[PDB]
Design an enzyme around this catalytic site. Structure first.
Site, PDB file in Angstrom:
ATOM      1  N   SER A 195       0.853  -1.196   0.000  1.00 26.51           N
ATOM      2  CA  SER A 195       0.000   0.000   0.000  1.00 26.51           C
ATOM      3  C   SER A 195       0.885   1.241   0.000  1.00 26.51           C
ATOM      4  CB  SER A 195      -0.977  -0.114   1.172  1.00 26.51           C
ATOM      5  OG  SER A 195      -2.122   0.676   0.943  1.00 26.51           O
ATOM      6  N   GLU A 322      -9.183  -5.588  -3.304  1.00 24.60           N
ATOM      7  CA  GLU A 322      -8.561  -4.398  -2.720  1.00 24.60           C
ATOM      8  C   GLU A 322      -9.576  -3.398  -2.165  1.00 24.60           C
ATOM      9  OE1 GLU A 322      -5.549  -4.215  -2.166  1.00 24.60           O
ATOM     10  OE2 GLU A 322      -4.340  -5.055  -3.806  1.00 24.60           O
ATOM     11  N   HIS A 435      -7.573  -6.011   0.949  1.00 23.08           N
ATOM     12  CA  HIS A 435      -6.366  -5.194   1.023  1.00 23.08           C
ATOM     13  C   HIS A 435      -5.607  -5.474   2.309  1.00 23.08           C
ATOM     14  CE1 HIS A 435      -3.994  -1.642  -0.086  1.00 23.08           C
ATOM     15  NE2 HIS A 435      -4.126  -1.191   1.149  1.00 23.08           N
TER      16      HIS A 435
HETATM   17  C1  LIG Z   1      -9.730   3.955   7.760  1.00 23.90           C
HETATM   18  N1  LIG Z   1      -8.637   3.511   6.824  1.00 23.90           N
HETATM   19  C2  LIG Z   1      -7.561   4.615   6.718  1.00 23.90           C
HETATM   20  C3  LIG Z   1      -6.296   4.160   5.982  1.00 23.90           C
HETATM   21  C4  LIG Z   1      -5.970   4.915   4.736  1.00 23.90           C
HETATM   22  C5  LIG Z   1      -6.100   6.286   4.562  1.00 23.90           C
HETATM   23  N2  LIG Z   1      -5.711   6.655   3.281  1.00 23.90           N
HETATM   24  C6  LIG Z   1      -5.326   5.507   2.569  1.00 23.90           C
HETATM   25  C7  LIG Z   1      -4.852   5.347   1.236  1.00 23.90           C
HETATM   26  C8  LIG Z   1      -4.537   4.075   0.807  1.00 23.90           C
HETATM   27  C9  LIG Z   1      -4.677   2.960   1.665  1.00 23.90           C
HETATM   28  C10 LIG Z   1      -5.144   3.127   2.966  1.00 23.90           C
HETATM   29  C11 LIG Z   1      -5.480   4.394   3.470  1.00 23.90           C
HETATM   30  C12 LIG Z   1      -8.036   2.223   7.355  1.00 23.90           C
HETATM   31  C13 LIG Z   1      -8.206   1.158   6.292  1.00 23.90           C
HETATM   32  C14 LIG Z   1      -7.654  -0.223   6.668  1.00 23.90           C
HETATM   33  C15 LIG Z   1      -7.195  -0.962   5.388  1.00 23.90           C
HETATM   34  C16 LIG Z   1      -6.376  -2.243   5.658  1.00 23.90           C
HETATM   35  C17 LIG Z   1      -7.225  -3.517   5.724  1.00 23.90           C
HETATM   36  C18 LIG Z   1      -8.367  -3.496   6.777  1.00 23.90           C
HETATM   37  C19 LIG Z   1      -8.220  -2.402   7.846  1.00 23.90           C
HETATM   38  C20 LIG Z   1      -8.728  -1.049   7.402  1.00 23.90           C
END
Ligand SMILES: CN(CCc1c[nH]c2ccccc12)CCC1CCCCCC1
Ligand SMILES: *[C@@H]1O[C@H](CO[C@@H]2O[C@@H](C)[C@@H](O)[C@@H](O)[C@@H]2O)[C@@H](O[C@@H]2O[C@H](CO)[C@@H](O)[C@H](O)[C@H]2NC(C)=O)[C@H](O)[C@H]1NC(C)=O
Ligand SMILES: *[C@@H]1O[C@H](CO[C@@H]2O[C@@H](C)[C@@H](O)[C@@H](O)[C@@H]2O)[C@@H](O)[C@H](O)[C@H]1NC(C)=O
Ligand SMILES: *[C@@H]1O[C@H](CO[C@@H]2O[C@@H](C)[C@@H](O)[C@@H](O)[C@@H]2O)[C@@H](O)[C@H](O)[C@H]1NC(C)=O
Ligand SMILES: CC(=O)N[C@H]1[C@H]([C@H](O)[C@H](O)CO)O[C@@](O)(C(=O)O)C[C@@H]1O
Ligand SMILES: *[C@@H]1O[C@H](CO)[C@@H](O)[C@H](O)[C@H]1NC(C)=O
Ligand SMILES: *[C@@H]1O[C@H](CO)[C@@H](O)[C@H](O)[C@H]1NC(C)=O
Ligand SMILES: *[C@@H]1O[C@H](CO)[C@@H](O)[C@H](O)[C@H]1NC(C)=O
Length: 526
Positions: A195, A322, A435
């Protein structure tokens, strides 16, 4: 076990792994703590110490806002920091095989988290299995995130931007200067990340100051050309100035704005980070990489297109689902605790959530291309379309486009499509191959049989670990011994890729061809 580094002696600790031993050095500092007048500046080199530094516990994680959306739920909380938050967080970790290797290839992990969150001490980033099983050295570092890592008044050295990327870079520099002392080969360093960590790896391929600090690169579910990955200079300044107004730090002299923000407690910075944009989305990157004229000398799309990057091999891939994780962070009708059958109207409302600044025509064009059903009566049609919209737009089509453009300049590239849902995945089944949930397979957690993964997942992880290690060591992600499917190079013509799953590993062509022509050729015009 004590290793003399160029700044002083460090003490490690012995681990028992699979009936063998790994030596772990956790929490080696690699920069002056960026505190007080050093907050927002590039990381400063480290003054020597005369004692023995005890690197026997993970260090502080960098200041960051926590995911509090599902208190008590392992599916989200497994990504929250597991050590104290502190601005004093510029530390790294080293796992070395035992006995000490002679010239081992080195793997350097860069964690993701939207450039706002993340830490190297997470359970799913534990490098002891890779060192044990493949006899590589694993290094991982904490780098600053959020405004403390990426606040930008471009050109102003008090807050130039990209500080967290420069943290990463100083850590690669530490490995160049010190890793031979650990039995590592500084000439055989492979960066890998997921990521935002993967987007970070891709920007190290573009940054001239990183070209001599690594050999090869692995990009898991991310690349700089993803729409969330790079902040323009306009928005970065607008966001810095909004943060200054939110904190009472608005001044006319830009340098006095930074000085005022230097006297604010980290919690006051963190609390106001979310509001510097007018319209957030679940994927907002309020403070992230910018074109600073230092780490990034030009807009990275231009560098990519015109071949201005490190010529080396890359390994790139994405996961089947994703997009689904982000749907339960705001899309109406969605919930991790039911099957999230949403209506057309709920779909239309979800696009407004994920494309808030996009014209009506632009949102209709998304609806038009993703809602031509194989069966109008399938109740999950809209639920699945929205996940694919978010996933294709934010991750899969940018990764494919990065790989296409990168390979056109002559280098070998290898692309995978990860489609195995972990048997231990605590999120519901409708979110599929989420993801972030290939990482535990890359790091070899399913090799630990005490941990309730299936035998098929043990085998899948074992093969993935071997391919990753062979890519790092030899630039070629084959598993040559167990009659495995040969992984072909990805070429811009034929676009072959390898599927990773527990049943049958397959060679396929032109992933998401119809969807990605939409996102890559039409949507950027709206
Ligand atoms: C609120 N979420 C903010 C994170 C975030 C902000 N901006 C981004 C841009 C690309 C990827 C992730 C992010 C968190 C998302 C996570 C994703 C991983 C798998 C399951 C748990 C939840
Ligand atoms: C799935 O759940 C969502 C979310 O609702 C919350 O979580 C549920 C599991 C339950 O605990 C509810 O009491 C919670 O409110 C449902 O979306 C809600 O639907 C109602 C009526 O349709 C609406 O008033 C709310 O605004 C919705 N919440 C949103 C949009 O965030 C959804 O209807 C459920 N779907 C299915 C198929 O069960
Ligand atoms: C560094 O550690 C020295 C030895 O510590 C040994 O290992 C740790 C993990 C403990 O189990 C400890 O009981 C062991 O003796 C210490 O003697 C030394 O004081 C430490 N230095 C500092 C600055 O804390
Ligand atoms: C640029 O900044 C303008 C001011 O933003 C407003 O005030 C700050 C403190 C935040 O609270 C923010 O949510 C407010 O909207 C915005 O009006 C403007 O839309 C911003 N963006 C652009 C592209 O101009
Ligand atoms: C509100 C809540 O916790 N609901 C249910 C959870 C979650 O929906 C999933 O684990 C995905 O998050 O799953 C269970 O069915 C289960 O797995 O035994 C138990 C529980 O009733
Ligand atoms: C490690 O390998 C490099 C080439 O990859 C070589 O130049 C170097 O001398 C080696 N160092 C050893 C074997 O200590
Ligand atoms: C802003 O403040 C700094 C700190 O003293 C100073 O060096 C700089 O000249 C000031 N800029 C202006 C335009 O006064
Ligand atoms: C190859 O197969 C053997 C069993 O025949 C297995 O134990 C081993 O882990 C496999 N190796 C890889 C790299 O997959």
């Amino acid at each position: 076990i004590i290793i003399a580094t160029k700044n002083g002696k460090v003490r490690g600790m012995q681990l028992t792994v699979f009936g063998g031993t790994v030596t772990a050095f956790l929490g080696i500092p690699y920069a002056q703590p960026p505190l007080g007048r050093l907050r927002f500046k590039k990381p400063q080199s480290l003054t020597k110490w005369s004692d023995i530094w005890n690197a026997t516990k993970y260090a502080n994680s960098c200041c960051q806002n926590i995911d509090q959306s599902f208190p008590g739920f392992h599916g989200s909380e497994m990504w929250n920091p597991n050590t104290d938050l502190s601005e004093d967080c510029l530390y790294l970790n080293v796992w070395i095989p035992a006995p000490k290797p002679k010239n081992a290839t080195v793997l350097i992990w860069i964690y993701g988290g939207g450039f706002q969150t993340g830490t190297s001490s997470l359970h799913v980033y534990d490098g002891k299995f890779l060192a044990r099983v493949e006899r590589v050295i694993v290094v991982s570092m904490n780098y600053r995130v959020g405004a403390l890592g990426f606040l930008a008044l471009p050109g102003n050295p008090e807050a130039p931007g990209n500080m967290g990327l420069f943290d990463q870079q100083l850590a690669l520099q530490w490995v160049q200067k010190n890793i031979a002392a650990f039995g590592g080969n500084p000439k055989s360093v492979t960066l890998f990340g997921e990521s935002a960590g993967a987007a970070s790896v891709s920007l190290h391929l573009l940054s001239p100051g990183s070209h001599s600090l690594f050999t090869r690169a692995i990009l898991q579910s991310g690349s700089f050309n993803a729409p969330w990955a790079v902040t323009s200079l306009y928005e970065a300044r607008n966001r810095t100035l909004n943060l200054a107004k939110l904190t009472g730090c608005s001044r006319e002299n830009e340098t006095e704005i930074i000085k005022c923000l230097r006297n604010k407690d980290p919690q006051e910075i963190l609390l106001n980070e979310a509001f510097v944009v007018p319209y957030g989305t679940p994927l907002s990157v309020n403070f992230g990489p910018t074109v600073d004229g230092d780490f990034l000398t030009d807009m990275p799309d231009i560098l990519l297109e015109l071949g201005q990057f490190k010529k080396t091999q890359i390994l790139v891939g994405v996961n089947k689902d994703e997009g689904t994780a982000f749907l339960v962070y705001g899309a109406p009708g969605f919930s991790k605790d039911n099957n999230s059958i949403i209506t057309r109207k709920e779909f239309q409302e979800g696009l407004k959530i994920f494309f808030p600044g996009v014209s009506e025509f632009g949102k209709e064009s998304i609806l038009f291309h993703y809602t031509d059903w194989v069966d109008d009566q399938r109740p999950e049609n809209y639920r699945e379309a929205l996940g694919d919209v978010v996933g294709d737009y934010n991750f899969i089509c940018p990764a494919l486009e990065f790989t296409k453009k990168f390979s056109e300049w002559g280098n070998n590239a290898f692309f995978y499509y990860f489609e195995h849902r972990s048997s231990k995945l605590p999120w519901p089944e409708w979110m599929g191959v989420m993801h972030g949930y290939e990482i535990e397979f890359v790091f070899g957690l399913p090799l630990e049989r005490r941990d309730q993964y299936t035998k098929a997942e043990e085998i899948l992880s074992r093969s993935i670990v071997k391919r990753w290690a062979n890519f790092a060591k030899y630039g070629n992600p084959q598993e040559t011994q167990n009659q495995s499917t040969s992984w072909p190079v990805f070429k811009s013509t034929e676009q072959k890729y390898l599927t990773l799953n527990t049943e049958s590993t397959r060679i396929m062509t032109k992933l998401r061809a119809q969807q990605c022509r939409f996102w890559t050729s039409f949507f950027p015009k709206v």
